[PDB]
């Protein structure tokens with residue numbers, strides 16, 4: 001009808017699905033937020049808002065949308081660059097970009113476009129993806145070392161590598177490695193590794209408690225409030241639209257590619273242009289409330305489905321579990337150390353870089369490598385300096 005496929009069977013499936021997808025979203029929404037440079041709060045609220053509305057208004061019932069880790073990476077550059085231009089409205093501006101990219105998605109969908117962003121070749125997707133993975137890893141380079149990220153970032157960071165060398169925090173590195181370890185080697189499929197890693201890492205600051213280490217600090221309790229546009233007449237503004245153009249585009253490609261995975265596991269098919277409209281709305285709303293930009297998650301989505309999610313009620317439920325978790329359990333986050341999140345973010349990076357493809361045309365091999373290099377260069381560029 002006017003919304004995504006919602007019906008009142010799969011109450012059990014949709015409930016187990018939403019709640020599994022909420023606990024998965026939680027460690028990486030914290031991670032992506034911090035990494036973003038916007039609050040940890042910006043990460044969560046995107047996860048709720050993009051999640052909810054895209055679930056309410058899209059065309060893929062099983063689909064779990066959220067700040068996705070090529071959304072985070074792109075968005076993180078944008079924010080950096082817009083703060084460097086205007087430290088008083090940079091963030092705000094960036095949220096306005098999230099909104100604008102929302103709008104773009106709405107249009108690409110409203111305009112018989114969703115169809116042919118499927119025409120992307122694997123080699124390109126794979127280059128982009130391994131490209132984004134590398135960046136994410138290097139961002140965590142600095143959190144791993146136990147000092148905060150420099151302003152490059154990653155040019156700032158690589159610039160700052162030298163005596164970032166010996167200002168080290170050994171316990172933090174130890175903490176970060178420990179986290180990676182927890183995720184990497186637990187055979188012994190619920191108790192998802194990331195939530196396990198997250199929880200143990202915190203509490204293992206009953207071993208390393210006497211030491212000082214960085215944690216997510218306290219943070220805005222409870223409800224979020226409307227930040228309408230600063231579009232700002234900027235010398236920025238021309239830069240904002242190119243930014244909204246990429247972000248919107250990227251968010252469709254990521255939302256869609258997954259929606260194909262959603263198709264696979266379910267024997268169902270889905271509606272692209274409606275999905276893009278769902279993504280648009282979810283993003284517009286997220287920006288309107290300081291959330292990050294999102295798209296369809298594919299870690300979030302498969303786990304929802306295996307739990308047995310079958311209806312957009314999965315999504316709705318997910319976003320509301322999250323919602324109460326944020327507004328009631330805000331105090332817990334504050335003790336979660338940054339190293340643990342770095343570790344988590346690190347492996348997400350590691351996990352999205354494509355390496356089988358490493359170790360079949362001589363063309364593709366090359367295209368990929370270039371797309372990789374191209375994708376780190378533009379990233380490095382987009383951050384002012």
Ligand SMILES: CCCCCCCC/C=C/CCCCCCCC(=O)OC[C@H](O)CO
Pocket residue numbers: 070124125128129250253254257258298351352353371374375
């Ligand atoms: C020539 C012009 C330069 C081109 C440069 C830009 C390339 C285009 C961006 C592609 C977006 C691909 C997004 C793919 C995200 C889907 C990821 C996915 O479906 O699976 C994730 C999994 O975790 C991973 O192993």
Ligand code: NA
Pocket residue numbers: 068254255257258296297298
């Ligand atoms: Na995805």
